[PDB]
Design a protein around this ligand. Structure first.
Ligand SMILES: Nc1nc2c(ncn2[C@@H]2O[C@H](COP(=O)(O)OP(=O)(O)OP(=O)(O)O)[C@@H](O)[C@H]2O)c(=O)[nH]1
Ligand SMILES: [Mg+2]
Lengths: 74, 49, 50, 172, 74, 267, 340
């Protein structure tokens, strides 16, 4: 999990430019699976900014899942 | 109530038994209908065989 | 409140009257009725097992 | 044609277990049986009758009443000159669904198809729940003829088809 | 095509699979000949004992089996 | 002679209305009345199985996707049953067509009274909401009910609702008019299907819950609901050049959200 | 901490009120089944009563959605327990309203809520007996959910009260609906096995469904007086509707004992009949739903069409496969129908 923060910025660098609902949902699944394996510093400082982003997503399913993921991560 | 409670436990023990007597009776009645059905099925299947 | 409490006492007193006025059922008389049915149940369970 | 004057296609519709099959068998074969064999798909029997001096060949069609074998679209109403909506007089739900069955008639049958509300099982007088007045008022509001028939004891089964055949003939 | 062991197989040529298979009742007889409806609605199988058995090709189930009165091969 | 052959459809993501499911009838017999079990459990005599031929069953419809429920279960309104289970009730589901993913199912559980404050599942059945090529299911469907279990909403469901199986479909196609009509042949063939059906009734204790899906109509047209996502036509303008920009960066000209979170918490 | 804690309480408190006033009942419903009792800690024992509980109480006014009325009773026990005894006064009339609901599944939910609130000691001592008196007639209700929900309440009440109160207060209510007065009625098995037969569903429905239900019970009450000797004789019905209804009831098997149970349920059936009649007045508007047809004219959605006679997203590819299948099916039917 020491190298995980290197993979996290691979994922989070995609999230502001995703187009399809499936890739925004898969992006959310990844965050949820990695969340227990990252430090609270990575969760709050790095991943929360990108869950509040999907909360403002155009797709209602994406917004709905962003909150559901955020709740489980926090 | 102490006197009625004792007698009322029995009144339930009796009534509860009655329900098991009824059920067990009809269970035999159903258990015996499968006798005539499956024994007759046994017969017909033995002549058929 | 005094009326409610007095009514409660009247109720319990009446029920005490009913419980005392009725003859306490003979446990023996009901118990034989239970024992006769216990014999029937067991005699039957044997039949069911067969 | 020397074989017959008119050929009327009659259709029997209604809920499962109302006696659509038994009415058909009581009319075409003059038989009754308690053995229920849910109709699937479509069946038909042919009986030729005498009516007003004319020879009428009736092809009476029996249909599945079970929802499991029914669909929204229904091809069977096509080409039918008359439709018998059978309900079980002992079964209120069957009578209630007559409205549903009439909507299927209205949207799938001919615009001028003839209709007939039949309350079968009138021989079950102790179990009857739908009164003759309740059904007669309902049928009269819609103008469709109404009979209470019984396939079990042949009560009024012939006249229900004779009525339909006569009404269709009056229409032709 | 019909086979000696009672299977009347429908082989699709533009594929390699069967469109259908009809297991003829060899109690009836050996298939000697069969005919198919020009409307492709039903078929009739003629057997060596005179049985001619009909199949509904729309539903693929047998519907009739009339036998010759002398049980003469078809 | 016939209306035209045009296929009309609406995207599921464009039909912003609640899904509605009709609960029709529950055909079939229940698990008899095993009086062996009642001697072991006396509470079992006080259950719908043993109190009426048709207990007043109810159905709960819940929509699941990816093994998770999309919203709460919806229950059929009370209907007193005497000789047949026929709810005939349209249930407005808490999910809309835009809300439904491609693997959305409806898990339908038939429930019965089991003593005070306890419902037992009579059976369960699950059917996918979209078909094999992503069209919302239409019309009347008969679903296999799995005895003594709740409908499973997991992916894949262990209680799928979808000889008589094949024939019923052909029978429905015949009744709708899709199969060619041949009177002499239909008369003979359906008697055999009836024999098959009766044999299956006696052979198995199967139950079917017939359900119906609403029809989308506009100007007497029929629209199928096909699964789509908004922007599903946005074929990405992908281009294979790497003359200067060898290493594309997706976050390239994007707000730094970790700095804005910090700005919002310090300033 | 006191400021941050109160700010957090106000933030959550505003979002719960926002969700309890949602335009969709499913949102209000969803909020109740997830954690409304857990959110009571943010409101506090007093605002949970003043704000949160008052909001939930309005859910019972929704007479066109029984699911919301049922969801209120599934969650009222947690809020009532949290608010404490000050909520028993406001909820007592609402719980009685829940027992005369138009949907019998809301009665079962109200019965259950009463059961749980009795288990928790939330029902005041005198109010426990008033609910027992009103719930006793359900022991003969044709609906088994209601009948067994009533058994659930009565057994719980008997456990809460002393054995003296069981014989002296609760048993008097149960004697009409019990074949044999057993003091062990705290056990579900004991009560269930001593129940009398319920009113027949058919007979119950005939009486319940009659428009003149009030005049029916008025007459049925006089038939009982002749039975009880309180009258020398009972004249036939004075109204042709009651005459027709009474002969329908007697012919359909209405026993003298079912008349007595129907008279015990009289209060429940008149209020329940009244609730159903109120909703029916509004039901005249919402009739198109029963028909299986959706009309697009209410939204004007983009309808699309293809002729079946002539990256890529997964849904786009799958549409083309569906349209291909549609073209093939119509062609197949056309050819098949052409051969015949
Ligand atoms: N007493 C009585 N019973 C009848 C009468 N007609 C039919 N039945 C019974 O009801 C059953 C159902 O009758 P069917 O004719 O098979 O009913 P159906 O309308 O054909 O039902 P489906 O074929 O499934 O649509 C029969 O098996 C009989 O036992 C009747 O006139 N009187
Ligand atoms: Mg039939």
């Amino acid at each position: 999990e020491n190298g995980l923060v290197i993979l996290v910025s691979v994922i989070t660098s995609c999230l502001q430019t995703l187009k399809y609902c499936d890739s925004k949902l898969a992006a959310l699944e990844l965050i949820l699976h990695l969340a227990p394996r990252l430090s609270v510093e990575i969760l709050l400082d790095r991943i929360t900014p990108y869950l509040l982003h999907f909360s403002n997503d155009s797709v209602p399913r994406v917004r709905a899942e962003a909150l559901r993921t955020l709740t489980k991560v926090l | 109530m102490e006197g009625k409670w004792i007698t009322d436990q029995l009144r339930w023990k009796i009534m509860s038994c009655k329900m098991r007597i009824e059920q067990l009776k009809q269970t035999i009645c159903k258990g015996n209908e499968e006798m005539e059905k499956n024994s007759e099925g046994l017969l017909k299947t033995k002549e058929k065989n | 409140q005094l009326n409610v409490t007095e009514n409660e006492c009247q109720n319990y007193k009446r029920c005490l009257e009913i419980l005392e006025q009725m003859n306490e059922d003979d446990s023996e008389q009901l118990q034989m009725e239970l024992k006769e049915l216990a014999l029937e149940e067991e005699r039957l369970i044997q039949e069911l097992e067969d | 044609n020397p074989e017959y004057d008119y050929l009327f296609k009659l259709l029997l519709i209604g809920d499962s277990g109302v006696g659509k099959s038994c009415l058909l068998l009581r009319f075409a074969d003059d038989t009754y049986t308690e053995s229920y064999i849910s109709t699937i798909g479509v069946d038909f029997k042919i009986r030729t009758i005498e009516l007003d001096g004319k020879t009428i060949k009736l092809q009476i069609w029996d249909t599945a009443g079970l929802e499991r074998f029914r669909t929204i679209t229904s091809s069977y109403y096509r080409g039918a000159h008359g439709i018998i909506v059978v309900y079980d007089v002992t079964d209120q739900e069957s009578f209630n669904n007559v409205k549903q069955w009439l909507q299927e008639i209205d949207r799938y049958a001919s615009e001028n198809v003839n209709k007939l509300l039949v309350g079968n099982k009138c021989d079950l007088t102790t179990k009857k729940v739908v009164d003759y007045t309740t059904a007669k008022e309902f049928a009269d509001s819609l103008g469709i003829p109404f009979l209470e028939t019984s396939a079990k004891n042949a009560t009024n089964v012939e006249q229900s088809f004779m009525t339909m055949a006569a009404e269709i003939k009056k229409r032709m | 095509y019909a086979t000696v062991n009672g299977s009347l197989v429908g082989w699709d040529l533009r594929s390699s699979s069967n469109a259908w298979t009809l297991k003829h009742d060899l109690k009836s007889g050996l298939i000697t000949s069969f005919a198919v409806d020009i409307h492709q609605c039903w078929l009739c199988i003629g057997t060596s004992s005179g049985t001619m058995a009909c199949w509904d090709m729309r539903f693929q189930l047998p519907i009739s089996s009339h036998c010759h009165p002398s049980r003469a091969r078809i | 002679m016939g209306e035209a052959e045009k296929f009309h459809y609406i995207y599921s993501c464009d039909l912003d209305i609640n899904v509605q499911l009709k609960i029709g009838s529950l055909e079939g017999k229940r698990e008899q009345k095993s009086y062996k079990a009642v001697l072991e459990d006396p509470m079992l005599k006080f259950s719908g199985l043993y109190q009426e031929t048709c207990s007043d069953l109810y159905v709960t419809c819940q929509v699941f996707a990816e093994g998770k429920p999309l919203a709460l279960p919806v229950r059929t309104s009370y209907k007193a049953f005497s000789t047949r289970w026929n709810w005939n009730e349209w249930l407005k589901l808490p999910v809309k067509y835009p809300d439904l993913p491609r693997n959305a199912q409806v898990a339908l559980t038939i429930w019965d009274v089991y003593g005070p404050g306890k419902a037992v599942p009579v059976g369960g059945t699950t059917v996918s909401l979209f078909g094999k090529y992503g069209m919302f299911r239409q019309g009347m469907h008969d679903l296999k009910v799995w005895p003594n279990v709740e409908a499973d909403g997991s992916e894949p469901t262990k209680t799928p609702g979808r000889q008589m199986s094949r024939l019923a479909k052909l029978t429905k196609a015949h009744r709708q008019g899709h199969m060619v009509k041949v009177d002499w042949l239909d008369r003979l063939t359906f008697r055999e299907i009836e024999m098959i059906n009766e044999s299956e009734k006696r052979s198995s204790n199967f139950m079917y819950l017939m359900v119906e899906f609403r029809c989308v109509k506009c100007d007497d047209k029929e629209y199928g609901i096909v699964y789509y996502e908004k922007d599903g036509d946005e074929s990405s303008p992908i281009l294979t050049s790497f003359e200067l920009v060898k290493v594309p960066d997706p976050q390239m000209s994007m707000e730094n959200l970790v700095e804005s979170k910090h700005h919002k918490l310090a300033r | 901490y006191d400021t941050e804690l109160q700010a957090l309480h106000e933030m959550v408190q505003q979002k719960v009120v926002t969700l309890l006033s949602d335009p969709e009942n499913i949102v209000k419903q969803t909020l109740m089944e997830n954690g409304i009792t857990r959110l009571c800690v943010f409101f506090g024992r007093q605002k949970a009563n003043d704000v949160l509980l008052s909001h939930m109480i309005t859910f019972l006014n929704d007479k066109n959605d029984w699911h919301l009325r049922g969801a209120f009773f599934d969650s009222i026990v947690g809020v009532a327990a949290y608010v404490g005894w000050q909520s028993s006064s406001i909820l007592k009339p609402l719980l009685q309203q829940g027992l005369s609901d138009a949907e019998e599944f809301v009665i079962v939910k109200a019965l259950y809520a009463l059961t749980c609130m009795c288990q928790l000691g939330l029902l005041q001592k005198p109010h426990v007996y008033e609910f027992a008196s009103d719930i006793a007639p359900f022991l003969c209700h044709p609906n088994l959910w209601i009948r067994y929900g009533a058994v659930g309440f009565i057994t719980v009440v008997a456990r809460q009260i002393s054995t003296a109160d069981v014989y002296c207060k609760l048993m008097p209510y149960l004697d009409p609906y019990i074949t044999q007065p057993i003091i062990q009625i705290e056990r579900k098995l004991v009560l269930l096995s001593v129940l009398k037969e319920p009113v027949s569903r058919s007979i119950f429905d005939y009486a319940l469904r009659s428009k003149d239900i009030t005049s029916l019970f008025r007459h049925l009450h006089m038939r009982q007086k002749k039975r009880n000797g309180s009258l020398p004789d009972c004249p036939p019905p004075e109204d042709p509707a009651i005459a027709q209804l009474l002969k329908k009831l007697l012919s359909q098997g209405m026993t003298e004992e079912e008349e007595d149970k129907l008279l015990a349920l009289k209060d429940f059936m008149m209020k329940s009949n009244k609730a159903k009649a109120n909703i029916v007045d509004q039901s005249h508007l919402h009739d198109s739903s029963q028909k299986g047809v959706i009309d697009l004219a209410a939204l004007g959605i983009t309808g699309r069409q293809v002729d079946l006679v002539k990256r890529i997203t997964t849904c786009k590819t799958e549409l083309q496969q569906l349209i291909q299948q549609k073209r093939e099916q119509c062609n197949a039917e056309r050819i098949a129908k052409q051969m015949m």
